[PDB]
Design a binder for this molecule. Structure first.
Ligand SMILES: [Zn+2]
Ligand SMILES: [Zn+2]
Length: 624
């Protein structure tokens, strides 16, 4: 019910450009629903999104028992219509978290500037080049063109090979260096998901926003070194884990459990991106004091004009079926699709958890909440304990797992709530619940189990509820996708299961069915997960038994005995209790029928794709 006071001198340039590039249809809506955001104007626009997602036909026909399981059919029920997005905005994005008291702002100031120093000892900030951007971007990124001069392209790889795209970039950078910002504007779309189960992970209603491709280069140019040089990697950050895949996250949770201390706390912040305060964006900007003078100017141009002052375009339903685009402003919060969204969240989250250990270890008191009593004590505790507490953390974005020195961590909440990083689904002052067994700790939408191998070895495999994995695969990201295109996406989900969730009985059988129903020569396409830890080693025509040995045996630094595994039958499953607990259907009437007649179902899918294609029998590589 307060703010914004829009800094019109910084954002007003882009406002009048969007206004005057639509000056015939620009108007001011008196009935706009934006309470905590700064409204600027509206103009007519076509509709976008869909009330429901299309279902992958190949995966659906090969997963009949789950047509009645609400846990998997609900994942395809995402809503992206302008009405569905506005329902998310008024609930999760149109908020205002009160300012932390002055004493709390001091701790964040001290700890943040301390971590940037530790993070930049073995590393050196630098500018990122044009060729680094051309090699990193995939053929189909988000073009995100919003202006007239920016809609000259159709694909992302097409733009980067055109000297015209790098001409618009040079002008905006020259606009930045002169003190203005002319074209860095966010596109915002929303997803309202019909959800969920009790403790189902990963997917909730959220807002997705990103800038256009040229703006994200200037973003990647000034601060892209955080991702390219692996500043949030575990080797350099201690508590980070950037770069490690789902085949390695389990070992860290096990590594932490052996160290002495209390329980393992994996509390989850509700709406982490929205809970970012204007003081945290200042503390994240402390990295600017380590850059060369040419770099420092480019960085502040991105920070002041893209991070600390944002302009967003949002759709909204109007009268008579027509829709309309809104222009709004916001000074705090984090855009979900900023180039360094993951790195800046991992940093801030490390600072938050570092502070929470202080409140538990009786370093900070309620005195310090409203005014720092003795600020000389904060820097002392960080140098004799700060790095020891980072190495007992695992932070990936807004996901964190902390191993405190004792169980006073569960009650250290006053500094946490004042910083706005409130916990999800808990009373404001109820102590946090901890985990005694690391194999139950949630982290990155997964728990991690220890799989004992046939020859006396062991890997730590990732695991999650089975309905979330089948439901995701049954989703086709767009209409008009061909039969071949949907089959290649089905092959990607199947071969991903063969690499990470092979220990699940239903997933290995369904994967062998999909691989037996999709032609053997066809190259898998698509994106099976948007998580940073899904490195995508399954996107290949290579024999999945070969790639299994590479990520679990050959290149596993936790596996000293590197003797290869020859058969798929030599790799066990989880215990039937653990498999059933995570959503398996072993023993049920319809699942047993589906397993018996899976060859008949695979043969029918083969006829949809074509009798002419060459197929392989991956079901005969499994007898049990
Ligand atoms: Zn700009
Ligand atoms: Zn499990």
């Amino acid at each position: 019910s307060c703010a914004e006071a829009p800094n019109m001198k910084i954002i007003g340039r882009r406002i009048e450009r969007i206004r005057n590039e639509h000056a015939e249809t620009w108007f001011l809506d008196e009935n706009h629903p934006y309470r905590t955001w700064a409204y600027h104007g509206s103009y007519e626009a076509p509709t976008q999104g869909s009330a429901s997602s299309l279902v992958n036909g190949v995966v659906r026909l090969l997963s009949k028992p789950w047509d009645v399981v609400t846990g998997v059919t609900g994942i395809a029920m995402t809503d992206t219509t302008p009405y569905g997005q506005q329902r998310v905005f008024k609930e999760k994005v149109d908020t205002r978290v009160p300012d932390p008291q002055e004493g709390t702002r001091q701790v964040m100031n001290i700890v943040s500037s301390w971590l940037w120093k530790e993070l930049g000892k073995r590393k050196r900030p630098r500018v990122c080049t044009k060729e680094e951007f051309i090699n990193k971007v995939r053929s189909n990124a988000a073009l995100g063109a919003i202006f007239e001069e920016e809609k000259e392209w159709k694909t992302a790889v097409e733009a980067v090979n055109d000297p015209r795209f790098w001409a618009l970039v040079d002008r905006e950078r020259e606009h930045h260096l002169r003190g203005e910002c002319h074209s860095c504007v966010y596109n915002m779309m929303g997803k309202r998901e019909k959800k969920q189960g009790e403790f189902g992970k990963a997917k909730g209603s959220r807002a997705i926003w990103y800038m256009w491709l040229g703006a994200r280069f200037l973003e990647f140019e000034a601060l892209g070194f955080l991702n390219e040089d692996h500043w949030m990697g575990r080797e350099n950050s201690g508590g980070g884990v950037e770069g490690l895949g789902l085949q390695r996250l389990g070992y860290i949770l096990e590594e932490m459990n052996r160290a002495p201390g209390g329980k393992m706390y994996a509390d989850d912040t509700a709406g982490w991106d929205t809970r970012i305060s204007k003081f945290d964006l200042e503390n994240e900007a402390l990295i600017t004091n380590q850059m060369e003078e040419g770099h420092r100017t480019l960085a502040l141009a991105v920070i002041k004009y893209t991070y600390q002052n944002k302009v967003v375009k949002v759709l909204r339903p109007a009268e008579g079926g027509k829709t309309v685009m809104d222009i709004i402003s916001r000074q705090d919060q984090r855009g979900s699709g900023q180039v360094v969204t993951y790195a800046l969240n991992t940093f801030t989250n490390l600072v938050v958890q570092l502070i929470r250990n202080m409140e538990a270890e009786e370093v900070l008191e309620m005195q310090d909440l409203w005014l720092l009593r003795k600020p000389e004590k904060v820097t002392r505790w960080l140098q004799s304990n700060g790095w020891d507490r980072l190495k007992r953390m695992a932070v990936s974005g807004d996901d964190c797992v902390v191993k405190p020195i004792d169980d006073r961590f569960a009650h250290a909440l006053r500094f946490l709530n004042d910083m706005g990083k409130v916990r999800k689904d808990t009373q404001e002052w109820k102590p946090s619940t901890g985990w005694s067994n690391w194999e139950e700790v949630p982290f990155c939408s997964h728990h991690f189990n220890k799989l004992y191998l046939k020859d006396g070895r062991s890997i730590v495999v990732p695991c999650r509820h089975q309905d979330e994995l089948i439901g995701r695969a049954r989703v086709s990201p767009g209409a008009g996708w061909s039969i071949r295109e949907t089959a290649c996406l089905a092959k990607s989900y199947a071969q991903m299961w063969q690499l990470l969730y092979f220990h699940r009985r239903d997933l290995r059988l369904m994967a062998n069915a999909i691989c037996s129903a999709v032609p053997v020569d066809w190259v898998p396409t698509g994106r099976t997960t948007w998580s940073i830890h899904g490195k995508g080693e399954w996107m290949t025509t290579e024999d999945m038994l070969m790639v299994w040995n590479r990520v679990w045996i050959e290149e596993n630094d936790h596996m000293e005995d590197k003797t290869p595994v020859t058969k798929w039958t030599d790799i066990p499953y989880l215990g039937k209790r653990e498999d059933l607990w995570c959503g398996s259907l072993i023993g049920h009437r319809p699942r047993t029928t589906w397993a018996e007649n899976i060859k008949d179902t695979v043969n029918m899918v083969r006829r949809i794709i074509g009798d002419e294609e060459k197929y392989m029998d991956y079901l005969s590589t499994q007898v049990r």
